[model samples]
Target: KKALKIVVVGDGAVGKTCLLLAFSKGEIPTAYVPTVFENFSHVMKYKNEEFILHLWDTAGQEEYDRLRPLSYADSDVVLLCFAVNNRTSFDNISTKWEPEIKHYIDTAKTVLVGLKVDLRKDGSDDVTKQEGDDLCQKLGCVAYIEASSVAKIGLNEVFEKSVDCIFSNKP
Candidate 1:
């Protein structure tokens, strides 16, 4: 089996761990403990490409923040997640995550996944589709996707595109 290392970066309580658990384990629980994980991982096969992605729910506190940039080293892809409803989370995507990720990896391997699109139903979320697209363009990410953790929607595409970008993605 082949593997691609990846990281998931976001603010605390933004459901980064839940998204990893669902994509990696295929189960969404009614409740989640905030992440104690420096990293969590999952493997999947798409188009005969086996990918093992190590998703870091890397610590977001001030003490752990210094180590954040180091987590991106040698990762094949990065999932820069931001909450749609939370303005601080989205702002951190640009203010914090981008600088931290780029400090380790280059422009080519990262992708953006804007989590909790469910908030858009109310039309008040500060993060918009255009805004995300612009951010990806600025960062040279492979693509940007919107998803919901509790609903299990968009997980497949997240992993699918990940593998597709890593290997030949052929049987």
Candidate 2:
């Protein structure tokens, strides 16, 4: 009965679109194509209540920097995504995406997401779950999720926690 707008932001090739497609269509994209702007809508059932989720997929390339903020308007939740194997994407949360999101929709709740977890090699330099949790704590995000579109892991929880944040009383 309600519609919530969720915007996914991160560095290019961090699997932002893959996450959305995996959750919305149950399909994983075979190739990476730089996204300019895209959106998806799905009816989700959470806690016996129905909700229309407006998922906005954004381009993370520097060329779209001026136009990406256009999708941040009135966002209910922001999914700050990063690839587990890419350290720069993780660091950019503090340097780039977080500041940009706060500048536009400061009131929107944020969820820190580590994407492409399946690609992580244990004992390697990949981003760890604890690191993500630490950043979420530092940034005061509503939740943190590690997901892999190829593995179909944590995809549902990503959107579910987002919906829950809408009703969260934490300040």
Candidate 3:
């Protein structure tokens, strides 16, 4: 059995855990307890190959700044998440998460993710798709995906593109 390590990083309360929970468990968490460090595994079957996708969720609080990169070792792909409604979170994708992940595993393929897209329906001033796409390009991310854990939208596509990135021949 082979495995792929997918590390997720972002600002606190940006729905990082919720995205993983929604994908792995098929349900959104009802409560918010800031994650310190957690990992989930999903067995994926792709073209007659079985892969164990190891999803690592890191705490985004400043208190864990010194300890978070411990999870980035040997990562196959990194999902850089930000809430579509939070400008700070979106900005940190470049200011914080991007540099942090590259500092640890420079070879890991990166994916830009916009979480909590469901908020856009409420007339929230959210980060637009064009903005996400532009950031993805600016950061050299292999792909950009917009998803909502509560709405159950684009959850699978996030991981699917991640695995695709791992298997692709891109440098």
Candidate 4:
């Protein structure tokens, strides 16, 4: 009977939309359409309980900089996303996104989501799970979930942790 707000933030083409789309629709999207500030609603069932999860998706481009933080207000949890292939995206978690969230809300639960881990198969990604765990420690995130939309991997883990964030206070 509680409403949980989750704000997702990261750079463009980092599989933010792909992850959301894959979760919301239960399938991978055939085309890429840049997100322009969107919201999604889903009833999450966890441990024999239900919570209405409001997911706010913000555009990552610099042009939307002025409007992106509008989604941060009253967010119960924040998903700080980055792609495994895009190393700099990971760096910005500390350099940019974390600071932005801190500015809007103090002491919000955040999960570090590593996207497109499927890329590691073709030898395209240089990053490792250790790096993700290290960043989670450095930034003080509550949890780390590595997901791949293309192969439909780790999608459940991502949202399940979001639900757990609200009920168990584990983030």
Give the local distance difference test score of model 2.
Answer: 0.93
lDDT of 1 by residue, 63-156 (tens): 6676677676688878888888877887888888877877777743777888877666555656888988998898778888988877778888
TM-score of 2: 0.96
- Highest TM-score model number: 2
Worst 10 residues of 3 by lDDT: 162-171
Q: Write the per-residue lDDT of candidate 4 for residues 1-171, one digit (tens) a residue.
A: 877898899988898888887887888668888888989898877777877878898898878999998888889889999898898898888999999998997657899999999887546655688889998898888788899998999998898888777677543
lDDT-better candidate, 1 vs 2: 2
lDDT of 3 by residue, 7-87 (tens): 999999999999999998899778899999998889977757888999999998989999998999999999999999997
- In order, candidate lDDTs are 0.76, 0.93, 0.91, 0.86
lDDT of model 3, residue 27: 97
Ordered from best to worst lDDT, the candidate numbers read 2, 3, 4, 1
Each prediction's TM-score versus the true structure: 0.86, 0.96, 0.94, 0.93
Q: How many steric clashes between backbone atoms does each model show?
A: 0, 0, 0, 0
> Any runs in candidate 1 off by more than 4 Å, and if so which?
169-171
lDDT of 2 at 70: 93
Residue pairs clashing in model 3 are: none
Give the worst 10-residue stretch by lDDT in candidate 2.
Answer: 162-171
